[PDB]
Amino acid sequence: ATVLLEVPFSARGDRIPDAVAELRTREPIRKVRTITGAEAWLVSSYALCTQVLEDRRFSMKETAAAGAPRLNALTVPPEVVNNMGNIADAGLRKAVMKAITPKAPGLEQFLRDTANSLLDNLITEGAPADLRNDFADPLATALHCKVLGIPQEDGPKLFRSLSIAFMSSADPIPAAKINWDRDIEYMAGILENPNITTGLMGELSRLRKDPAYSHVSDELFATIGVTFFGAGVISTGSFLTTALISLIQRPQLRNLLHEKPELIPAGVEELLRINLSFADGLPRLATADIQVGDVLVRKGELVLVLLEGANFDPEHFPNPGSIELDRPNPTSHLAFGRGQHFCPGSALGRRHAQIGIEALLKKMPGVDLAVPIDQLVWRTRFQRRIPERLPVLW
Template identity: 35%
Template sequence: MTCPHAAAGSVRTYPFGDRVDLELDPAYAELRAGDPVARVRMPYGGEAWLLTRHADIKKASADPRLSMHAGADRDVPRAAPRGLDSVGLMGMPPESHARLRRLVSRAFTARRVAELRPRITEITHGLIDGLIAEGGPADLVQRLALPLPTAVICEMLGIPNEDRHVFRAFTEALMSSSRYTEQEVAEAAEQYADYLRGYVAERRAHPQDDLLSALIEAHDEGEQLSGNELLMLVGGMLIGGHETTAGQLAGHVALLLRDRSRYEELRARPELVPTAVEELLRVVPLWASVGPTRIATEDVEIGGVTIRAGEAVVYSLASANRDESVFENAGDVVLDRTHNPHIAFGQGPHYCLGAPLARAELQCALEALVTRLPGLRLAVPADELAWHEGMLVRGPVELPVTW
C-alpha cells in the first residue's frame, strides 16, 4: 500500500503505507522529486508540513524557530499517539536542554568512547563465544544485538545487567505506537520510575565510579540537576543507550545477509567495517515513521515554501539519506562509499548524544562477526523474517542465523 499519486501542493494522508522492514515507501522518492515540502494529514492532531530532502532537513534541524518545546505540552499534529513529554529532554526549553546535554555529553565524547572500546570488544566476543559454544541456529537479536548495548550502558551507569528486564518492559511500552494501551504505558512508566528512584537512592548512599554517581553528585552538590531531571536523564540514557542500537545492529546484519555478497565483501575486507557501518546507518531506516513534531514560532521559509508561525513540521531522516541529489546511486548499498554525509543521528541541537557509542558498538559487533563467524547466514528465507509492528523503531523481531 502506497500513497496515491497527488498533485504537488495537495494534502496527502500520512503515513503512506505500512512498511516496517528495511524498505521505504516509494512515496518519499516521489515527494523529493516533486513536492519536497508537502502538506500531510497526520494520524493525530491534524495537518503538518513534511520535509523529505536532505538540504531542507539539515536547514530545519538547525533553525531555532522550528521548536520541539513549542509543541511539547499541547496537542500537535504527530505520527505517534503520545506527544513529547514536557519534562523530556527533547521537549525542554532550549536553555535547559543545552544545560543538560552539556552535563551528559562528557560521557559520550569520542575520547571517552575510545577508552571504552576494549570493554565493548570484550563484551562482544564474550557474547559470540556463547553463540559458538551453544551452536546454531540462534536468534541474533537476543544473543547479540540486544545484550551488547544493554550491557554497555548498564556498566556505564552502574546498573546491574540483571535488572534490564525492568527498563526493557518500559522501553517496549514507551516505544510503541499502537501495541500497548495508554494505561499499559502509564503503568510501565510508574514501575520504571519507582525502580529508578530506588536505585538512585542506593547510589546516593553508596556512590561508585560510574556515570550515575557523577550525575547524582551534580544534583546533590552542584545543584545543576533537579530530581526529575536526574530521573529523566538516567531513564533516557538507559532507553536510548540500548533500544535504537539493538534495532540498528539487527537491521544491519539482516541487510548484509539478505544479499550475502555484502557480508562476503566485509569478510574479505574487514578493514571496511567503519565505512560500511556509515553506509548501513544511511540505508537502514531506524524509525518506523517521521520523528518528533516541531512548531514554527515565527514564519520560516524552507525549500521555497513559507511555513507560518504556529504550523507543524515533521521530517524523514530516512528519506534525506536516500536523496539522489546528495548520494550517488542513493538506492544502492555501497559498503566502501567515501562521500557519505548521512544524517542518521539527526542534526543541530538534537543531534544524538550517543552517536560515538553507537558507532563503536556497531563496528565492534560487525568486526567480530565477519572475523569469527565467516559462514554466518540466515537460517530462514529473508522474506520470512518478522518485523516489529506497532512500534516507533524498526527492527526484526528475531534474526535466526546459523554458521
C-alpha cells in the first residue's frame, strides 16, 4: 500500500529529478500531498502551467483564505499575500515599478563596483571562498539597500530575517512574526527619516506626504519596503547562487562567456530557464470549477504550478537540459512567472545576475568547485533551493 505522492520532490537545486519528466509525460496534472497534509493539483507541463498562470480564476490572494488547503503556513500577514494588488489599489504601481528598474543612474556601476570589491576580498583571503555567503548574497543585499535608498549598513540585519521569513513550513513560525514586526518598525522609521530621499523608500516617503496619497495607510508603505527587500534579496541571491553552480558545472560555457562577454545576457536567460531556485510550485486557489487537461479542478482546490515542469518541457524547449544560447524562444520560460503576478523585479534580477557573472568570470576565470558537488548541503523546508555554502577555488 502506497501513500499519495508528496511534494516537494527534492531540495537539491543542482539537478532536476528524473521523476519530473515521467510525471509530465504520464500525468501533467495530478494529485499530490503537501507538507501540511493538504491535497493539491501539481501541474508540470508548459501548456498547463501557462494556462493556470494566465487564468485569474486561479487566485493568489485566495490562497490566504482561512480554511483553504495550504502548501505551507503563512509567514506574513494574510493581507500581504495580496501585496501587489494592494500596491495597485493605492495608485503606487507605476512608482514602485519605476524605482526597481536597473536603469536608475549609477545603479549598474554600483553593482559592478560592489561585485568587484567582494571578489577582491575573496582573492585576498585565498581559496576556498564561499560564493553564496561571501558573494551572491552580499551582492543581492547591497543591491537592494541601494534600490530601496536605505543605508548599506542596515542590510545584514534585514537579511538575517530571510532564513526564517522564506521558510516553507507545515506550521506557523513564531520567529517569523518577531522579525516581521521588527522589520516593519524599521521601514516605518525609514519613512519618517529625512535623510532617506533616494530609491524606493525615498519615493514612497515623498508620495506619503502628497495629497493624492493621504489616505494610503502607513502600514502599506512600510510593507512595500519589507516585502520588496525580502522577495528581491532572496530571489536574486538564490538565483545567482544556483546559476553559478550551473556555470561551474559547464567549463566550456564558462570559457565561452569569459571569452565573449556579450553573450552573457543570452547565457543568463538560459540559466534562468533551467534554474531550480523555486523549491515549491507556485500556489493558486481555484475560485471556480475549471478544466485543466484531463482534470476538472473544483472551486476551493489548491493548484501548484511547477516552474521546472514548464521550463524543462521538451515540447517547448527541445533538449531542455542543455544551455543553448540560440533558442528561438529564449525569454518564453516561466522563471519570473506569467500573467497577473509576473515578477516586477525581472529586469533587476537579470542585471544582478549578468553583472555578478561578468565580474566573477573576469576576476576568477578558473573558478571551480572546491568540493565534490554531492557535498553541497541543500536547505530544506524553504521556499528556495540553495546550498548552505558554495565552496570554490580558482
